[PDB]
Each structure stands twice: as structure tokens, then as C-alpha cells.
A = this chain, B = another copy of it.
Amino acid sequence: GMINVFQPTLGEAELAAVREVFASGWLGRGPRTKVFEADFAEHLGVGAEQVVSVSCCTEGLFLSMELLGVGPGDEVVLPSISFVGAANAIAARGARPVFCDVDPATLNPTADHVAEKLGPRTKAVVVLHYGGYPGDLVAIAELCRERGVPLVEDSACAVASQVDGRACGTLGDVGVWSFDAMKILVTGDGGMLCFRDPELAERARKLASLGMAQRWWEFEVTAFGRRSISNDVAASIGSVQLRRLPEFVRRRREIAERYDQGLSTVDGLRCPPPLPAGHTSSYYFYWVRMDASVRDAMARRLYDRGVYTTFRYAPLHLVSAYGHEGSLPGAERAAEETLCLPLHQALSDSDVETVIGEVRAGLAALT
């Protein structure tokens, strides 16, 4: 067979929610979207007026660069280890994405890494929480606050992560989540925005709805917006997935701890570093580090043995589309030494033991 790196778990509970939406006859953005937004805001510890449901996280990232007003001559700092949609959201506006480095052991940037790229042109910072680890999020948010620079949190890895009881995505100025088929809370497709400023959230609702502002069929256009909204079919699924999310993360956590127990004695292999005090992870990735000369061979050997692996996220500063970038040794090293092992709540205990054994046997053969 084949053990996947990512996998969602939707079933009869989610189907029953879809059934009610079909039977209601209202499948577009409606009462289910309001409920899911309020449910998610409670999950974050924010008001319901601060959260805006969108079609996907990429669209949320694009909208945030539009709302922040970035454009030609501006710069937006984000780690080279970022989702390609983040850099595209910057570049499509005419702004220049400026890539900072990361700690190769965590693939998260430190506050110093971010600060080394800030300048008079910086109009925003974008950061993710690699694998669910918040990283240096608190010091980064404090840095951007002192510099007067808006901080956008791409929280797609960290739907349930917290620092000292504060949900990731709420420490900066804008938070963006993904609910696509590869994440944890999964609605097929779907995204969420969270604005520290409620008035900026009100602009997002209008912009996501074609820039419209409303006999009752006439309207005005305040911006040439796209259609960036989700629907009640996805939202009703989201409320169910949100209730199951703690169970998902608990299962992902015990799998990760079993990985630690089975792989922490292996020479030439580094498991993920421990979570800092007061940090909780969503356990989105389980990344192992090895010598660069065997990382690719490991992935190919594991693929032949029925264990799929991959790497996230490809260093965007090596993508020539984004212009002349410099050297980023942390991201360059991680891109050569890191491999992501399967980690999701659909893994059986048999799959977990298969991954552990195939990784041990693979390393012994390549060393």
C-alpha cells in the first residue's frame, strides 16, 4: 500500500452536517458561516466581529496584502521557508518579498532573522509556525510592534497551537488559516481571517464580497474585489471538524511521541527539538534531520517501501521569480537535510510502527 504524509478524517458526523445544509436549500454563505465564524473566534479567544471566513488561506493571504496597501517600492519580510502563496500575494501587488533566514533545527525564523531584513521599505511581516511549533512568535510580534510593522500570521500549520494560552494567529495583526484537504481542520476547501482591528475586518468582508456595499438589489462598489467567500456547506463541516480538533491533535501528539521513542536513539538522525515551556503544537509536521547526502536517497527508499515522505516548505529565496536574493544558510541547510514523515490522525498504530522501522532500516543501510 501507501502511507500518506497528510490525510483528513471526515465521516458521518460531517456528512450529517452536509445533509442539513442540502435539506435547508441555502448552500451559500449564510447562517452556518456565522456559526462557524463565532465558533472559531471562541477557539481563538477573539470577538466574532474580528473573524472573516474566506475561500482559502491563499486568498486570505492575498486579501491581507491588498488591505494593508502594499505595492511598488514596498517590501514584505517573510522566511524563505514559507508557503509560495504568501510570496505570490506580496509580488502580485508589485511589492518585493524579502526572505529572511530560519533556524535549521526548527525551520522557524528567530526575531533576529526577521530584524536583519527590516528597513524603511518594510510594510508587513509574514510568518508561519513550522509544523505547529509557535517558534519565536512572541519576540517576533513584539519586534513588529516596536517597529510599527504589521504582522501577518500564516497559521495554516497551527490551527490549535498556543503560546501561554494565546492562540497562534492572534499575536500579530492579521491571522490566516487553511482548511484544505491537507490540513487538520478540513472542510475540503476553506480559509479564515482574524483581524486585531475590527474595522479592518469590516473592510475584509466587503472586499471578499466583490467590494460590494448595499430596491434591495442595488449596490455600490468600493473596490474591484474578487469573490473570496466560503459557503455554508463548508462552514457546517468546519463546526464539526472544530469540535473534533482536540481529538485530532491528541492522536497526532501520541504518534509524535511514539516517533520520538522509536527514533531518538538513532545515530545520524535528529528528531524535532522539544517544545519550549508554555508552547503547545498542533503536530502538523514531524520532521527529521539527517546528512544531505542521504536525505534524497531516504525519501526514494521509503517510497519504494510504501512510506510516502516529502519536504515543506521549498526555500522561496531559491525561486528565481522573486528576484535577486542573497544567501540564507539556515534555510539552505534545512532544504537539504530535512525530511517530513507521515503525521496525521488517520495513521493506525501499524502504520506508525511501519514508519519507525522503515526509517531505522533505511538509515542503517545508508550509513
Contact = CB atoms under 8 A, between A and B. Distances in A.
Given A188-B233, A219-B314, A4 B25 contact: yes
Copy count, this protein chain: 2
B216 A310 contact: yes
B226 A189 contact: no
A260 interface: no
Contact of A18 (B18, B55, B310): B18
Contacts of A296: 215
Contact of A28 (B55, B59, B85, B180): B180
Contacts of A312: 217
Q: How large is the interface on A (under 10, 10 to 19, 20 to 34, 35 or more residues)?
A: 35 or more
**Which A-B residue pairs are the 10 nearest by beta carbons?**
A28-B181, A58-B227, A27-B181, A221-B321, A92-B224, A188-B233, A88-B224, A91-B224, A10-B22, A217-B311
17 contacts: A11-B23, A15-B18, A15-B19, A27-B181, A56-B227, A57-B227, A84-B210, A85-B210, A87-B224, A88-B224, A91-B224, A180-B231, A188-B233, A189-B234, A219-B314, A219-B319, A222-B321
Interface of A: 4, 7-11, 14-15, 18-19, 22-23, 25-28, 55-59, 62, 84-85, 87-89, 91-92, 180-182, 186, 188-189, 210-212, 215-227, 230-234, 296, 299-300, 310-312, 314, 319-322, 346
